Amino acid sequence: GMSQVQSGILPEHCRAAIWIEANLKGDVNALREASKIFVDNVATFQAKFPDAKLGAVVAFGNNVWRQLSGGEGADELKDFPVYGKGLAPSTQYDLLIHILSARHEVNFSVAQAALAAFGDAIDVKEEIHGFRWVEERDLSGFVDGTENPAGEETRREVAVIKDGVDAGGSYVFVQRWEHNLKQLNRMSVPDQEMMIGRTKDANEEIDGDERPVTSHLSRVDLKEDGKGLKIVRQSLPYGTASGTHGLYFCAYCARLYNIEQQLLSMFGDTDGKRDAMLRFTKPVTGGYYFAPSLERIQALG
Numbered sequence: 001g002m003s004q005v006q007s008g009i010l011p012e013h014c015r016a017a018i019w020i021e022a023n024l025k026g027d028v029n030a031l032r033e034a035s036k037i038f039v040d041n042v043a044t045f046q047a048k049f050p051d052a053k054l055g056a057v058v059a060f061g062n063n064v065w066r067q068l069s070g071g072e073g074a075d076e077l078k079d080f081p082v083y084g085k086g087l088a089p090s091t092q093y094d095l096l097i098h099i100l101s102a103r104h105e106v107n108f109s110v111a112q113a114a115l116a117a118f119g120d121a122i123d124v125k126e127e128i129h130g131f132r133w134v135e136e137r138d139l140s141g142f143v144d145g146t147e148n149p150a151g152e153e154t155r156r157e158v159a160v161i162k163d164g165v166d167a168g169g170s171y172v173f174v175q176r177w178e179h180n181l182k183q184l185n186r187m188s189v190p191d192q193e194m195m196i197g198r199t200k201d202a203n204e205e206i207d208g209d210e211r212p213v214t215s216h217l218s219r220v221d222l223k224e225d226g227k228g229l230k231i232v233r234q235s236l237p238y239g240t241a242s243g244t245h246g247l248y249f250c251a252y253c254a255r256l257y258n259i260e261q262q263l264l265s266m267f268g269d270t271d272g273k274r275d276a277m278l279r280f281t282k283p284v285t286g287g288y289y290f291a292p293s294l295e296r297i298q299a300l301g
């Protein structure tokens with residue numbers, strides 16, 4: 001009588017991922033059988049490739065999740081708002097598929113199985129292939145992940161809903177950033193470090209009273225009476241060297257509130273100041289999704 005989390009939320013250090021964002025074209029009932037087929041395919045791929053340490057998540061947008069759930073649970077779920085009156089655009093879609101493992105080839109086969117399961121009931125809007133870069137660096141050259149929740153126990157505490165109808169579920173936020181590395185390279189390495197809030201090569205935290213309030217860490221390291229608003233990030237670099245490249249931002253949280261507070265801070269809604277990373281990179285997509293527990297994907301129908 002308990003709930004099982006979807007396999008793609010908790011895994012750490014996965015070197016590769018595939019994110020598919022899509023709109024529902026047909027009847028919402030088509031997503032019920034397709035989701036059951038896909039979670040079945042993920043279990044089949046895990047049995048065939050045990051050393052891939054494969055995980056996947058199927059998550060739903062506000063409109064379609066209210067229909068599938070009959071309005072029960074997922075109290076915080078809503079369409080992703082525009083933050084900063086436009087600084088963070090909104091591209092809310094109906095379905096999110098997140099696949100992650102140690103092997104891109106296996107993720108690609110799993111992505112093909114997801115497309116075969118949903119078929120022509122969906123319209124694919126985005127497909128991004130994430131890759132861990134050297135020293136787990138973001139393409140800017142700064143290490144991405146140091147203060148991210150560590151170990152299964154703390155990651156469950158931060159990302160997984162504990163009780164009630166949504167037990168085992170999680171809220172997902174996805175946002176694709178396009179880096180302008182030419183604009184970053186014009187900045188001196190000390191100016192870049194003040195923009196992030198950590199040193200570049202050694203990845204040391206700059207003290208809060210020594211770094212600007214617009215620094216990335218000052219915008220997102222938020223506390224409410226000493227309790228941090230933590231999230232489980234699964235972001236990865238993406239793109240081509242000569243074309244579009246940047247960071248595909250992805251985060252899971254048991255409460256959508258923690259993610260929203262960080263976005264209100266970053267995009268100027270809380271105190272009128274915005275994230276210094278906006279001098280070289282910009283978000284171009286944005287969406288909120290609800291990832292139900294595994295047994296509630298089996299109860300669809």
Ligand code: HEM
Nearest residue numbers: 138142143144145146147148177220221247249262263281
């Ligand atoms: C271009 C996009 C982004 C880049 C390159 C980026 C990069 C980084 C870097 C380098 C760190 C420091 C090392 C660490 O992980 O602890 C960091 C920390 C963090 N970022 Fe971001 N980030 C981006 C977007 C976001 C967004 C959109 C959110 C949330 C809405 C976010 C939330 C966080 C959190 C919570 C931390 C850890 C803060 C702490 O407690 O020390 N980031 N990010």
Ligand SMILES: [Mg+2]
Nearest residue numbers: 147205221228
């Ligand atoms: Mg801290």
